[PDB]
């Protein structure tokens, strides 16, 4: 149809700072025209594995709305971001649903998020009472006490602080290097057809 203003695909993929994985951010892309060419043209990235659609033909189809997320994770565990996988971030931080129709993008950031002394701006949750229903965020910082005696906000055996801090260093191997991840989640109900890419006539 009509409408020509480009979607803000540069505010998310060029942002200097990415929010930590435990408290991720949610962005709405609507009322614009998408341009997926730039994504795989400019950025040298790996693992463009998308679910529910072939990466080649994202231009022809029209979509209802686009939801953009973003965070940073460890290198060896990037495979955990997929339905049916089990892991610390999958169980406690970010869980994908069984029925998913969208893509994931992951790229290395060893030249951005690496500190000689050690980065401490990125944190992940380590343990929780139960799993998480898909698309849920947590900001809780209260102590989870596994001991019978109530620690009640103190430090002691059988009690641990829920959060743990990453520490990225240039001397680490490729396995532990940080990776920036952005997931795009779609829905193909195709009633309004508002936010789809370029087509003529």
């Amino acid at each position, epitope marked *: 149809p009509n409408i020509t203003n480009l979607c803000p695909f540069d505010e998310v993929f060029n942002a200097t*700072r990415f929010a930590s994985v435990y408290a991720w951010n949610r962005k709405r892309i609507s009322n614009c025209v998408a341009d997926y060419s730039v994504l795989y043209n400019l950025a040298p990235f790996f693992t463009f594995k998308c679910y529910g659609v072939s990466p080649t033909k994202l231009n022809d189809l029209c979509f209802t709305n686009v939801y953009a997320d973003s965070f940073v994770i460890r290198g060896d565990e990037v495979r955990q971001i997929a339905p049916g996988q089990t892991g610390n971030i999958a169980d406690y931080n970010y869980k994908l649903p069984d029925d998913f129709t969208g893509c994931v993008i992951a790229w290395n950031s060893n030249k*951005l*998020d690496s500190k*000689v002394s050690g980065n401490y701006n990125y944190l992940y949750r380590l343990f929780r009472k139960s799993n998480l229903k898909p698309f849920e965020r947590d900001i809780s910082t209260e102590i989870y006490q596994a001991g019978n005696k109530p620690c009640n906000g103190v430090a002691g055996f059988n009690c641990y602080f829920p959060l743990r801090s990453y520490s990225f260093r240039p001397t680490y191997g490729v396995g532990h290097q940080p990776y920036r991840v952005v997931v795009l989640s779609f829905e193909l109900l195709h009633a309004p057809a508002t936010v789809c890419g370029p087509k003529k006539s």
Partner: antibody, heavy 125, light 108 residues
Framework: EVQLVESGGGLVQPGRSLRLSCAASGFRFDDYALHWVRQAPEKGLEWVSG????????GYAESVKGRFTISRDTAKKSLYLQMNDLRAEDTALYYCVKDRHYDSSGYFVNGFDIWGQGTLVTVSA | DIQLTQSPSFLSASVGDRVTVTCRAS??????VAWYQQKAGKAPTLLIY???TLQSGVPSRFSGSGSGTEFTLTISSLQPEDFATYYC?????????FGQGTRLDIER
């Protein structure tokens, strides 16, 4: 255009405090680290202080540590370097600079991009 | 901490020549180094970062190289506005340290 303005400088005497103000415009204040630098006349350059994006990593020079206070406020887009126990050694021109990658130092990409015109501070008996 | 030394304190040159400034460190700082140019009575501006990557709006004549504890800044061709002062900066630790400064002069 990105602009930084320094104010509050002038002449003081030893043993008295002072305050400055580095107003910023033209860029998002909350996604960049800032530093305070000083330069003596015809004596090269010298670093004074720096702050992080969320005021979590602060570093001072030995000869300067324990005497001054750096503080950033995002409400008014301001950076303040509160002064204490001045001597004649601190008479210099002060620059307020903005780092480019939201954190102090150690990262691969770092550099002082935009430098303010600075203000003159002299201490004397 | 880590000390940095400018090899030429002052260096005379003429238009269209080749010049090099050697900023030598004490410890191995990998490639966390930068260079700055200060005009006559003006606030210094950035020239190069990581000694290899041009930042923005900088003439292609400027270049940099180095590794370990040695760095060099290269000017392919000299221009009348190139007469200024040059500083080198460490970026490995947290007490940052600037070089003693290199001043360029006309040749006559």
């Amino acid at each position: 255009e990105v602009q930084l303005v320094e104010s509050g400088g002038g002449l003081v005497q030893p043993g008295r405090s002072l305050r400055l103000s580095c107003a910023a415009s033209g860029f998002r204040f909350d996604d960049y680290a800032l530093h305070w630098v000083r330069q003596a006349p015809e004596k090269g350059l010298e670093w004074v202080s720096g702050i992080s994006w969320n005021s979590n990593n602060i570093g001072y020079a030995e000869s300067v540590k324990g005497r001054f206070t750096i503080s950033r406020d995002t409400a008014k887009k301001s950076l303040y370097l509160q002064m204490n126990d001045l001597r004649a050694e601190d008479t210099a021109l002060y620059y307020c600079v903005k780092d480019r990658h939201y954190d102090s130092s150690g990262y691969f990409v770092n550099g002082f991009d935009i430098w303010g015109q600075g203000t003159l501070v002299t201490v004397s008996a | 901490d880590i000390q940095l030394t400018q090899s030429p304190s002052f260096l005379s040159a003429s238009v269209g020549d080749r010049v090099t400034v050697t900023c030598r460190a004490s410890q191995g700082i990998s490639s966390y180094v930068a260079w700055y140019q200060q005009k006559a009575g003006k606030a210094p501006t950035l020239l190069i970062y990581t000694a290899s990557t041009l930042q923005s709006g900088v003439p292609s004549r400027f270049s940099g190289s180095g590794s370990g504890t040695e760095f060099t800044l290269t000017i392919s061709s000299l221009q009348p506005e190139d007469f200024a002062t040059y500083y080198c900066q460490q970026l490995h630790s947290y007490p940052v340290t600037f070089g003693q400064g290199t001043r360029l002069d006309i040749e006559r």
